[PDB]
Amino acid sequence: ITVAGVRQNVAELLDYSNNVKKRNFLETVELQIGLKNYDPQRDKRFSGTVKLPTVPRPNMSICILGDQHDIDRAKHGGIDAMSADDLKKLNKNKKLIKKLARKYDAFIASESLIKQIPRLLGPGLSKAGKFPTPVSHSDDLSAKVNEVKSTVKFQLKKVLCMGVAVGNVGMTQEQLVANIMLAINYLVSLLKKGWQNVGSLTIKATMSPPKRLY
Amino acid sequence: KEKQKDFQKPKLKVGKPKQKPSNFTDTSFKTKSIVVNQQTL
Amino acid sequence: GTGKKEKNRLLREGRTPGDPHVKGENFYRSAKKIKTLNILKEGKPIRDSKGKIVKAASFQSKEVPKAVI
Amino acid sequence: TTLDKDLREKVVGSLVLLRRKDVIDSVSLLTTLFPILISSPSKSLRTLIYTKIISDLRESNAKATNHKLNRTIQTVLHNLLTSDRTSSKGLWACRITRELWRRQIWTDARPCDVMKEACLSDNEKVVVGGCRFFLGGDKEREELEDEESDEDKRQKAYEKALEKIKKQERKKHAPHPLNFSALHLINDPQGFAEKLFQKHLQNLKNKFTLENRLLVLQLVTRLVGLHKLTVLPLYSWFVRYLTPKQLNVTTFLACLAQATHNLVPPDVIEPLVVKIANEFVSEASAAEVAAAGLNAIREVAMRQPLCMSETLLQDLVLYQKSKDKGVMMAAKGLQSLYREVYPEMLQKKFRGKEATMGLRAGEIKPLKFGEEEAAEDIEGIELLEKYKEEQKKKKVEQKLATTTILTPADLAKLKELRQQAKLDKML
RNA sequence: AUGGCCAGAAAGUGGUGUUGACGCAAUGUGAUUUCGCCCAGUGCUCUAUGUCAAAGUGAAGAAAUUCAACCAAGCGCG
RNA sequence: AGACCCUGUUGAGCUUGACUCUAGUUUGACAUUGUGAAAAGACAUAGGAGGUGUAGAAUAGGUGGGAGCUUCGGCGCCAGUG
RNA sequence: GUCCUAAGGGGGGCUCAUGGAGAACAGAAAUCUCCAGUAGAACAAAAGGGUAAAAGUCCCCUUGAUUUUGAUUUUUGUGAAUACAAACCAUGAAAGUGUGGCCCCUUUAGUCCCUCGAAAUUUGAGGCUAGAGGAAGUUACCACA
Asked: In whole angstroms, what is the distance from residue B12 CA to residue D320 CA?
């Protein structure tokens, strides 16, 4: 797949998203990948994370589930947070845990509380695939939120189809292109046959016609 | 494994009841009745 | 008749080449049957040209074992 | 019931013959045969009717998958299970599902749902039928994986290190343990495991035999281990059974090892490991009891290493000086497991060469709860860039992920360079 | 009977046969009187998926060639 | 120089799913083999239509976005049920 | 199918198993102190050989568990062990010590490796070099030497 073709594909994608037809919100540039010659169940389900150089979804909300010191750091940094008292007041209600999982796309928990998160919130976060990322009391929480925002996840499931968010319309062309190669190269590196198992590639915004890389 | 000792030491197996000693005598027996299937002459 | 060959018979039975094969094994004879029917064939020694025994018969050894307890 | 046996099997065979001659339909034949199958007292009649039903399904789905017929029969079996839980008539549907699954005629998630209803039942025979369906298919999956694999001094030390690196690569990309297609095809595995554990294992009023409770426990623990579920009361339930006096305690320990995984907290596994250490490895304990306990502890530490404290780990590793070979090998297995995983708890005497070299040079990092691999770049991408720079320098004499797309030959070269770097680090 | 069982290197060849089921051919048992069950296995015999040769077909290549389906009888199944 | 025992680079008769072959027989293809009709099958495409175990307003293949789309009537998000 | 087939080098400090006498709970056994203690401990031979300011144990640095060329022994090539020769190193104040652990087919690769013999290019093949893997009985019908 030619890189000039990549840059021109994202060129008409940004052109259509920003000039021809613009929605009322910030559309998200996303990559959809098919798979072939690969077993979903009898083989390994590959899992991996890679940080994009630029934040793909700046509107994503991240909750903080930590100690009082981390709550003070979060309210200093302007990040919403919840406490172990709040988790106890939820009282292991599946509906409330589902509402929290739907409301917050990502969670960051302190090292002292991450070993009690599956005790307090049951299996809800693991079911939603939103198990929190540990943070120590010495690490910078703003930086932690930065790689949590910049990271994407590549897990196999029961089907041979995947979809990831590689940026938004609002960022510029070259860093969009950089996000695209890091995502594609990381996926090819995770794939055990590399390019031989890749079915097809597709890039689009939230509401845009598809552009086929492959 | 081809060695044949005069006496074989029993091997303890965990999660199973202990075997009876070698000098234990078992007096339980079952009996079956022999029947001749012929009518009166 | 390729299908009546013993190789094809063992492949259709499932027994893999490399497994032990007793001499004389066919469709009618299994290994247990050969071991049973060779009992009626045992009882002969192996001799040289001059008539002396060079390999003993079955249960006819000539060796004195070490009988210790 | 009242006909002669030979006449009645002749009537069944003649109905199957008329189906073969296409006089009657498969649905009509099956609706004739199935109530007689579930209600007949004759064992030979039931066996032949079951054989004819299996043959009819095989002949129908041989040329093409008959989705309508499969759906109707699956619905009929599901209704048979749903009508009466306490009845023993569901074992026929269980046996039919096993036979069609092993013949690979049915591969949909609907047989898995039917056998899920079989597991969630009151009758012990249909419960263990569903449990055997979800469990004993692991052997069939292993056979299928074997078929797929069939289809697919210093120099000696370097070769041994390369073999170890190849074994590590096989562990990285090998089929996962405790894996089965039906187990993956179960919808709501957490809900299924919770219902099974609350229905059969928790209930003291259940009069199930110990082997059947162990089958249900094997199902629950394999579900939890495979799908990474979090079922906290199961670990507290294991506490009574973690005793050497318990029958099939080896099966219980294997179940607990299957139940443990990475996302399980160390807070719940550690009392179990402490209890196994107290009851199993001690001064008055037998050698076989100590070896079994240390093997179970090694398996639990394999699934989750953070359960154990450093003092307990050093105490258990010091059992390698024991005169019993089994206890010695179990302690050495635990020591080697923590050597690759987390050598910092291990003593400086017992860490080994590679562990001490890694800890001194700073490559080895502490393993913590919840940590996930977060490689910002591809593995070996720096080595691939160095190789590309060397090639450019050679061409002149005669960033990689940022600009250039990954060629497959370049990816193979990067994998070879990563393997060479791993071999050099091992050497 | 455009047949069954045989002969013959072949034949526009021959035996049964100048024959036609009260016959020809292959067997076992062996005057007269008296005298069940099982198709388990091995034989024999009847009726869409598996196994599936040569020829033929499709694809790749510059070709040699390679890979795929299709695949009669027999075997398996009943 | 018989009969008997023992030995063989032993010979020969016979038997059998022992090995390698073969007469005969059976099946398929090409040719002998000409003049005409009617059918189907398999691919190739040019397309089109579909999804109930229960609960849910409906009849949920799945995946990823997504709180806004909008033909301006609404569909949405929210809530409910999974 | 899982598990085990063993951490080597340098320097420094200290003695082990066990017995006797003592110390709240503490007793046969938990920790502490002294005396006696030729190895009765440990060192990956369960009653072999050898080791006490060590070959044991702990601490601090390290990977001589590294390349290259010959010689010897077990005996063409190996493998193992033994003293070295050259380089690069480690450790210690240094002498020194350390080159490990007390003792015939199949298939892959070769840029500048050689042939396919009228010449050349490309597939393919061969060679050489360096690797990886692994055909039954019976004879009381008989016959011969």
From this structure: 21
- Return d(Cα C5, Cα A7) in angstroms, integer: 67
DSSP one-letter code for D125: H
Question: How far is residue D197's CA from residue D187's CA, in Å, rounded to a whole number?
Answer: 17
Q: Is the CB of D360 under 7 A from strand G?
A: yes
- DSSP at D284: S
Instruction: Say if A182 is an interface residue toward chain D (CB within 8 Å).
Output: yes
B6: CB partners within 8 A, 6+ apart: C69
Taking an 8 Å cut-off on Cβ atoms, the answer to whether A115 and D369 are in contact is yes
D346 and D355 in contact (C-beta within 8 Å)?
A: yes
Query: What is the CA D290 to C1' G15 distance in angstroms?
Result: 32
Length of chain B: 41
End-to-end CA distance of chain B: give it in Å, rounded.
64
Contact flag, residue D353 CB and nucleic strand G, below 7 A: yes
Strands A106-110 and A81-82, how do they pair?
unpaired
Experiment used for this model: cryo-EM
D171 at interface of A, judged by CB pairs closer than 8 A = no
Contact A31, A163 (CB under 8 A): yes
Which of A46, A4, A12, A49 lies closest to A29 in space, CA to CA? A12
Distance separating alpha carbons of residues D51 and D90, to the nearest angstrom: 17
Task: List the C30 CA – F12 C1' distance (angstroms).
Answer: 31
Q: How many CB atoms lie within 10 A of CB D418?
A: 19
Q: What Å value separates CA D211 and C1' E13?
A: 82
Question: To which residue do tokens 């925002």 refer?
Answer: A149
| Residue B37 phi, psi (nearest 5) | -95, 80
Residue A31's DSSP bridge partners are A164, A203
Test D246 with B16 for CB contact under 8 angstroms.
no
Please tell me which chains touch B, using 3 or more CB pairs under 8 Å as the contact test. D
Is the Cβ–Cβ distance between A126 and A118 less than 8 Å?
yes
List, as one string, the DSSP characters of C32-59: HHHHHHTTTT----EE-TTS-EEE-BTT
Q: A183 and A18 in contact (C-beta within 8 Å)?
A: no
State the Cα–Cα distance between residues A22 and D236, nearest whole angstrom. 57
Across the interface, of A1, A45, A127, the residue whose CB is closest to D190 is A127
> Using CA atoms, how far apart are residues D279 and D290, in angstroms rounded to an integer?
9
Measure the CA–CA gap between D232 and A122, rounded to whole angstroms: 9
- For chain B, what is the radius of gyration of the CA atoms? 22
Q: Which residue of D has its CA nearest to B11?
A: D288
Nearest nt to the CA of D51 via C1' is E78
The DSSP element (H or E) to which A81 belongs, if any, is strand A81-82
Chosen for mutation from B14, B16, B19 (greatest number of chain D CBs closer than 10 Å) is B14
- Output the distance from D410 CA to E60 C1' rounded to whole Å: 25
Return the structure tokens found at A95. Answer: 């509906």
Resolution in A: 2.9
